[PDB]
Amino acid sequence: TKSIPTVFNFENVKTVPYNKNEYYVLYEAASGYSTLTWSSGNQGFALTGSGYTPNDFPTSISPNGRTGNCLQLITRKTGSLGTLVGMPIAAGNLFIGSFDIGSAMSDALSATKFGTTFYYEPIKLVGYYKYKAGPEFYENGESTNRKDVFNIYALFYEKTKDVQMLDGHIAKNNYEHENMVAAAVITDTHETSEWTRFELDFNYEHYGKTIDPQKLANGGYNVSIVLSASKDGDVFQGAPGSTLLIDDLELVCK
């Protein structure tokens, strides 16, 4: 049993081809730890057009980070086909888990699967952000000056035989689920061009669960971190151009 890293730097990417496009998959490797390979909706975005390079995608990295490179989440307008299949935008996102491309077009919420095996009890998610909403908010068949907001949260839950992963419905249901143990959700979400610290405490008291120390050691608990430039971009309410930069993210554990 090796733990994933708990400190995330956003330095590293590999380039992956799909549908005549290429995009980045971010990963974090540390000595004595299992490499975390982040997921995002980038493969879903690859379906909506051709000739995209990594920096056209909703999820990429920037060299203008606080320490070195940083996460760059930019909500994107989709290519011709996206609209016609009801995918007018694609939120700049990053999460722990996986992206099911079989669901990207029919059920966006199901496509983003959240979780990886975690042996610790997390207490807080700390990191730094910058955020600027895009100028036109897409909602319904309309483009408005509604001010887009971003989301940051983390999940800690108990696995069961028929519940191995959660998905995007968790953020549409007040973070409620029968397997849920703790959740950390950002509340202050203001725009800024200055690196701004966040510190989200995990709330175990809201769910009233009892941790099994054995099952925790046996790998029966998953954690996830989910980041998005557009809070409601999962249901295609968001602004193209909405940019969330994240750097020096750490899952502080017990």
Site size for Na ion (CB under 5 A): 6
CB 103, CB 110: distance < 8 Å: yes
Closer to Na ion by CB, 65 or 92: give it: 65
User: Which range in 10-18, 23-31, 205-213, 230-238 contacts Na ion by CB under 5 A?
Assistant: 10-18
Provide the minimum distance between the beta carbon of 148 and Na ion in the complex, in angstroms, as a whole number: 24
Residues 101-160 that bind Na ion (CB under 5 A): none
User: Which range in 42-50, 110-118, 194-202, 241-249 contacts Na ion by CB under 5 A?
Assistant: 241-249
Closer to Na ion by CB, 46 or 251: give it: 251
Residues 63-82 that bind Na ion (CB under 5 A): 65, 67-68
User: Which member of 9, 60, 222, 242 binds Na ion (CB under 5 A)?
Assistant: 9
Provide the minimum distance between the beta carbon of 32 and Na ion in the complex, in angstroms, as a whole number: 20
> Could you say whether residue 29 binds Na ion (CB under 5 A)?
no
Provide the minimum distance between the beta carbon of 91 and Na ion in the complex, in angstroms, as a whole number: 21
User: Which range in 1-9, 93-101, 103-111, 154-162 contacts Na ion by CB under 5 A?
Assistant: 1-9
Q: Which chain residues interact with Na ion by CB under 5 A? A: 9-10, 65, 67-68, 247
